[PDB]
């Protein structure tokens, strides 16, 4: 299933950043045009869309660049694929995105001061996800080298670096049939909550696989009767088994980042 | 022999990248080599 692998990991998606019409400028800036890695996350890949529009503006209104759509602050630790697939995956490509300057949302919005910053977070999700799967088991016994080499994979866009390591992240003891616990979030748009996150095992007590609907059946019943289950921007049959689509299927990562969105108006 | 709901996910995820991907791939490229220019 190496072929699922590259796929959802050069998956791309086209989208236009334009500049807040607020935003004082000595010239005209044009569009930048770019596609983004689903897996990966905006304040790493965004560098050029950067340097195109700070050259067009003055050092007194240059500040920490953040990204919105539709009035709607980007979070930037949570991958690409997943806003563009709750957010703007019912409107027409490619996905616009505002870039502003000025009047930072401090409350929606967490400083990406650098690099470091992005592979702290990243990381954190790597350690909570193999302390739900292996408690940590896995995670801990990876050399510090190792650890850089996941980063190093993703901000290079290397699928061979990046899985080299994170194969032995997928594996579980052989008596086992799968994973102690999988690692999942589900968004919604229309919910208070940012997401749902519980504990559930990928086997039942009489050993059959636990399938997509089932977890869904669980953690979110009302999203099954209307409703759109989109993961990497697509919709999996209900029956997947759902050990198999933590391995295959996740994020970099190793969280599953589901998305519960109403079907597209037209 | 693969399973039905893994054949899905494969062409769900080819149709994905052909409507997504494939289609703005050459006109991005085209479009960021003349821009380039202009910043001449």
């Known amino acids: 299933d190496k072929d699922v692998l590259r796929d959802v990991w050069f998956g791309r998606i086209p989208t236009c950043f334009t500049l807040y019409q607020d935003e004082i400028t000595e010239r005209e800036a044009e569009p930048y045009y770019l596609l983004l890695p689903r897996v990966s996350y905006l304040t790493l890949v965004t560098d050029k869309v950067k340097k195109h529009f700070q050259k067009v503006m003055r050092q007194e209104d240059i500040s920490e660049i953040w990204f919105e759509y539709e009035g709607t602050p980007l979070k930037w630790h949570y991958p690409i694929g997943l806003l563009f697939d709750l957010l703007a995956s019912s409107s027409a490509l490619p996905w616009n995105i505002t870039v502003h300057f000025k009047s930072f949302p401090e409350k929606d919005l967490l400083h990406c001061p650098s690099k470091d910053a992005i592979e702290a977070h990243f990381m954190s999700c790597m350690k909570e996800a193999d302390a739900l799967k292996h408690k940590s088991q896995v995670i801990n016994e990876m050399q510090k080298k190792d650890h850089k080499q996941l980063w190093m994979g993703l901000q290079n866009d290397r699928f061979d670096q990046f899985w080299a390591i994170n194969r032995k992240l997928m594996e579980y003891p052989a008596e086992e049939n799968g994973f102690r616990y999988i690692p999942f979030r589900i968004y919604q748009t229309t919910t208070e909550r940012p997401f749902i996150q519980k504990l559930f095992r990928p086997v039942a007590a009489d050993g059959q696989l636990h399938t997509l609907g089932d977890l869904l059946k669980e953690v979110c019943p009302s999203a099954i009767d209307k409703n759109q289950v989109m993961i990497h921007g697509i919709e999996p049959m209900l029956e997947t088994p759902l050990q198999w689509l933590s391995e295959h299927l996740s994020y970099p990562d190793n969280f599953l980042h589901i998305s519960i969105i109403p079907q597209p108006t037209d | ?40």
């Open chain 2, 1 to 40: 022999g693969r399973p039905r709901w893994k054949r899905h996910i494969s062409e769900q995820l080819r149709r994905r990248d052909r409507l997504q991907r494939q289609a703005f791939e050459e006109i991005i490229l085209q479009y960021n080599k003349l821009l380039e220019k202009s910043d001449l």
